[PDB]
């Protein structure tokens, strides 16, 4: 319900007013422009902040083509020195893209937040959702990327519930199988909770 409820009208169509009065000429920005803006050999955060701040105002359907460059360039957004609007606004753009293209966005975000390589598919993520909690070490202290990871983990847990129900229903050719699936789901959710709570520990390097 969070994804649909972030789509609702907030106060006074202020976003409509902004897309009426600030994006008169935004056709100069392109996905590849953001691509070499990110991939500069120095870290010029000013131009990427320019592009993403202009990218806030676009509709989600118009923001579909930038999913490739944003997701492929999440991994650079973990080094010590990135400004905070870059992380927060990439989080906002990810939340906007989550309202339209959620499954492809999640399966693309798994393959980018992984530590530095295995290319993962939707079937593996629905069979096992704990790869979402197998992200990079620096994600554990980056709040926007952890927020993305948490929405992704909740979505894949519900996904795994539906997938196990469907795989149990198809492969009948019954009470024992149903309770075994219930036990698997219960232990799965408990394991996810325990891994999250162990993320909540202070690490030994800072202690």
């Amino acid at each position: 319900v969070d994804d649909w409820i972030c789509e609702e009208e907030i106060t006074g169509t202020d976003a409509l007013l902004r897309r009426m009065l600030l994006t008169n000429n935004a056709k100069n920005h392109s996905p590849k422009q953001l691509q070499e803006a990110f991939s500069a050999v120095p870290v010029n955060n000013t131009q990427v902040m320019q592009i993403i701040e202009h990218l806030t105002l676009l509709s989600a359907s118009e923001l579909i083509p930038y999913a490739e460059v944003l997701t492929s360039n999440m991994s650079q957004l973990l080094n010590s020195g990135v400004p905070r609007r870059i992380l927060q606004t990439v989080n906002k753009l990810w939340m906007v893209l989550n309202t339209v293209m959620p499954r492809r966005l999640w399966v693309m975000t798994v393959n980018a937040l992984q530590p530095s390589q295995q290319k993962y598919t939707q079937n593996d993520l629905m069979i096992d959702p704990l790869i979402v909690l197998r992200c990079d070490q620096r994600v554990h202290r980056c709040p926007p990327l952890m927020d993305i990871t948490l929405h992704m983990l909740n979505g894949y847990l519900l996904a795994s519930k539906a997938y196990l129900s469907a795989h149990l229903k198809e492969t009948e050719q019954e009470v024992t199988r149903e309770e075994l699936k219930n036990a698997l789901l219960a232990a799965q959710d408990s394991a996810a909770v325990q891994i999250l709570l162990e993320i909540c520990l202070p690490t030994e390097e800072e202690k």
Partner: protein, 283 residues
């Protein structure tokens, strides 16, 4: 005559073949403007202003210096000439629109203050061109213009340009920026609630130690500093999901730890706030 001139101008705009007819039209417009200046007195540019607008539009030449034009604009600013300043600004903007060159970092601050003092109609585009291909530290010039020059409306744009090009609040120049946020202005609350919700936590801790540090100069305003403290206590990112307004009054949930001299400095700062009493009174 106005309809014929407008028809000729659309042909010159569409007909970009070698601009020989454009040169002939420019010469004809210059001759007509000279004749109108010589003879036209009572009919004050009823249609001659259309010729003036066409001549101004056709005069979009490209400057070939792009470094000494700043000095010419600065000299024109002391002379107080309107059309000369407009022509110089239009020439400087097209030169910056060309390939990037090496701009001086000393006369840019004086040139910006000159176009901000007098009402310049092309200030925003010129500032955008100068700060886009900038061969120097633009944040220092913006901070100096914001702190020193008391431009009424346009400083707001400067404030925007600050957050438009400085990624954090504190990035490279801490001293001028700290004296900008805290002093002995009107744009201070916006940049301060930014710095509350913009900077990274180590930078915020650096500011919180240098703010309530031992300093007898009293270089920070107490109201802004204390409200910055009180905001940093209750940032919504810290308490983002905790159950609200059912607490235990005996229990204390969380605080912010500071040191002994930090406590002494904070209490003498809050009593220095309390000892102002210009018109407030005891209550």
């Amino acid at each position: 005559l106005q309809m014929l001139q407008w028809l000729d101008s659309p042909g010159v705009e569409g007909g970009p073949l070698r601009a020989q007819l454009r040169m002939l039209a420019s010469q004809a417009s210059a001759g007509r403007r000279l004749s109108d200046v010589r003879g036209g007195l009572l009919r004050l540019a009823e249609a001659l202003a259309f010729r003036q607008d066409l001549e101004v539009v056709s005069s979009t030449v490209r400057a070939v210096i792009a470094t000494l034009r700043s000095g010419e604009q600065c000299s024109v600013e002391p002379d107080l000439i309107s059309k000369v300043l407009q022509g110089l600004i239009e020439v400087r903007s097209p030169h910056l629109e060309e390939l990037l060159t090496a701009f001086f970092s000393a006369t840019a601050d004086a040139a910006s203050p000159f176009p901000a003092c007098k009402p310049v109609v092309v200030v925003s585009s010129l500032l955008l061109q100068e700060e886009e291909p900038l061969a120097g530290g633009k944040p220092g010039a913006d901070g100096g213009s914001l702190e020193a020059v008391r431009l009424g409306p346009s400083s707001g744009l400067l404030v925007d340009w600050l957050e438009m090009l400085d990624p954090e609040v504190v990035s490279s120049c801490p001293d001028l920026q700290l004296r900008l946020l805290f002093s002995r202005p009107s744009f201070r609350p916006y940049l301060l609630t930014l710095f509350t919700h913009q900077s990274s936590w180590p930078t915020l801790h650096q500011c919180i130690r240098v703010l309530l540090g031992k300093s007898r100069e009293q270089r920070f305003d107490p109201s802004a500093s204390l409200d910055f403290l009180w905001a940093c206590i209750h940032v919504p990112r810290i308490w983002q999901g905790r159950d609200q307004r059912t607490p235990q009054k005996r229990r204390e949930e969380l605080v912010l730890r500071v040191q002994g001299p930090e406590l002494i400095s904070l209490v003498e700062l809050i009593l220095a706030e309390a000892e102002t009493r210009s018109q407030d009174g005891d209550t």
